[PDB]
């Protein structure tokens, strides 16, 4: 199972049975999975930073509930109505099962060398973004508890110019 997904840090990081066995029977499925996860978490990080300086002025529940007022971070999850996030997800699930926009087609050619290198770089970046999402959520929740339990009060601890 020593396909793409390896680099200088480890030639095959699987300190368990996980890799061996299901040879091309779960390896491809896990590639699909890790891909989707890393992409979504990249989008998460971009999410967190972008609400901090910019804000689209749309009124989620018309008349009131305007983006400009909802908290950024985890607090939006408590705010966002259950059914509201349900409808948002329903759009996302239709997108996953319809390819609606989001580059529905078009991936250029990318000869197999550059294509493989791009895919590997993708995997690495999304893997990193998983950990980035982790730290962010951690800090957020911890502060939400004791206001500055972590210390550094402002949500994005790095990028100090923002906050």
């Amino acid at each position: 199972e020593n396909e793409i997904g390896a680099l200088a840090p480890t030639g095959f990081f699987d300190p368990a049975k996980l890799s061996d066995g299901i040879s091309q029977e779960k390896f491809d499925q896990y590639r699909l999975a890790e891909l989707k996860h890393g992409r979504a978490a990249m989008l998460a990080v971009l999410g967190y930073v972008a609400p901090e300086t910019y804000r689209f002025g749309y009124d989620l529940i018309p008349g009131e509930l305007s983006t400009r007022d909802i908290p950024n971070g985890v607090a939006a999850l408590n705010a966002i109505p259950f059914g509201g996030w349900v409808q948002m997800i329903a759009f996302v699930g239709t997108v996953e099962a319809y390819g609606w926009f989001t580059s529905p087609t078009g991936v250029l050619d990318l000869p197999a060398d550059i294509l493989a290198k791009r895919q590997t770089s993708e995997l690495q970046h999304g893997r990193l973004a998983m950990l980035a999402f982790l730290e962010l959520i951690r800090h957020d929740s911890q502060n939400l508890a004791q206001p500055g339990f972590d210390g550094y009060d402002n949500l994005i601890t790095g990028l100090p110019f923002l906050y």
Partner: protein
């Protein structure tokens, strides 16, 4: 690829397809079909070249952005907003901050320039839809060698080559510059004159007063 000097470009990026063919195309979306993306008036005939269509795209953007630059300086510096409106100081000269100038100006002149560029692109499509072969940025008659308007272009083919180079380069650099000025003014709530002139001055905090000496 000398632009991206230690890198390879597209397996088929050309060097003579467009004047700006130094090879800069890292992701090189040129490779991708670049066709009637979401039915962009599909023709399947001459259809120019997909790269040449991206070239016409860059040409339109850079030309518009180039004009936009001067429309971000002259309202302030050159002519100091010669709005000279019969009445209504707002939506006129007064708003020298370009963002605020748009914030004021009534939809009359907005629809004026909107219909202006609308007829512009209508004539552009009227040409290009028939102007197959070399779409040549939908040139049609607009200041072409035939010069469909005054001072019908009177230059040489080598001068024409240099002129194509001039236009393409200026359009690209202005595409940078328009981003510049816009993010500048928005993130300063001013006009370019404001920050640049206090810059070229001496702050009022320190002036060593004057030479009041005997």
């Amino acid at each position: 690829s000398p632009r991206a000097l230690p890198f390879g470009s597209a397996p088929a990026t050309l060097d003579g397809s467009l004047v700006g063919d130094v090879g800069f195309d890292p992701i090189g979306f040129s490779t991708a079909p670049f066709a009637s993306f979401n039915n962009p008036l599909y023709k399947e005939g001459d259809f120019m070249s997909d790269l040449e269509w991206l070239r016409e795209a860059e040409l339109t953007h850079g030309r518009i952005a180039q004009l936009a630059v001067l429309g971000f300086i002259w309202p302030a510096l050159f002519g100091t907003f010669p709005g000279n409106e019969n009445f209504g100081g707002a939506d006129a000269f007064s708003y020298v901050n370009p963002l605020e100038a748009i914030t004021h100006v009534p939809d009359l002149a907005i629809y004026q320039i909107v219909g202006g560029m609308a007829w512009v692109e209508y004539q552009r499509v009227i040409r290009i839809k028939e102007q197959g072969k070399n779409r040549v940025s939908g040139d049609i008659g607009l200041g072409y060698p035939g010069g469909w308007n005054p001072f019908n272009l009177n230059y040489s083919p080598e001068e024409y080559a240099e002129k194509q180079l001039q236009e393409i380069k200026h359009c690209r650099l202005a595409m940078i510059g328009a981003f510049g000025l816009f993010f500048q003014a928005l993130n300063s709530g001013t006009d370019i004159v404001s920050q640049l002139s206090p810059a070229f001055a001496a702050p009022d905090y320190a002036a060593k007063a004057g030479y009041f000496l005997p």
